[PDB]
């Protein structure tokens, strides 16, 4: 079936907390915090998605989970560009990082919303 609304929120809290930390690091130009923030966010997002089936039956759940997971992966994909092992544009980079964080938060709400109606 579906997880409870209370459980979804409970997992969402750890997601928003880490995204806030990411936004905080972006405002202070602490780009070295981008990678570990994306790691924290990914792990929190992963735990949230674990509440829902791997292959969900409903369509809104399937689409929201897809966006949630892809954005989380896309987030640490962008954050990985902060460290070139061997020129880095932080302006273009931070724009993409925030948009990913937004998409994660957006998909998180969609999951809470569809769960509330079923409660």
């Amino acid at each position: 079936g579906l997880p409870s609304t209370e459980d979804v929120i409970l997992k969402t809290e750890q997601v928003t907390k880490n995204i806030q930390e990411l936004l905080r690091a972006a405002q202070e130009f602490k780009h070295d915090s981008f990678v570990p923030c994306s790691e924290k966010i990914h792990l929190a997002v992963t735990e949230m998605a674990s509440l829902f089936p791997k292959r969900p039956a409903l369509e809104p759940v399937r689409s929201s989970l897809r966006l949630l997971n892809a954005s989380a992966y896309r987030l640490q994909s962008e954050c990985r560009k902060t460290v070139p092992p061997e020129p880095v544009d932080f302006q273009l980079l931070t724009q993409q990082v925030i948009q990913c964080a937004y998409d994660i938060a957006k998909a998180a709400k969609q999951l809470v919303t569809i769960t509330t109606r079923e409660k």
Binding site: I9, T12, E13, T16, I19, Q20, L23, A26, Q27, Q91, T94, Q95, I98, Q99, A101, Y102, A105, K106, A108, K109, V112, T113, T116
Partner: peptide, 21 residues
């Protein structure tokens, strides 16, 4: 309640995006 706080974050993220634009 909980929906609002997430809306606050989304608003904050979108608000910050304009600052870099």
């Amino acid at each position: 309640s909980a929906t609002r706080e997430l809306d606050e974050l989304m608003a904050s993220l979108s608000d910050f995006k304009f600052m870099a634009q």
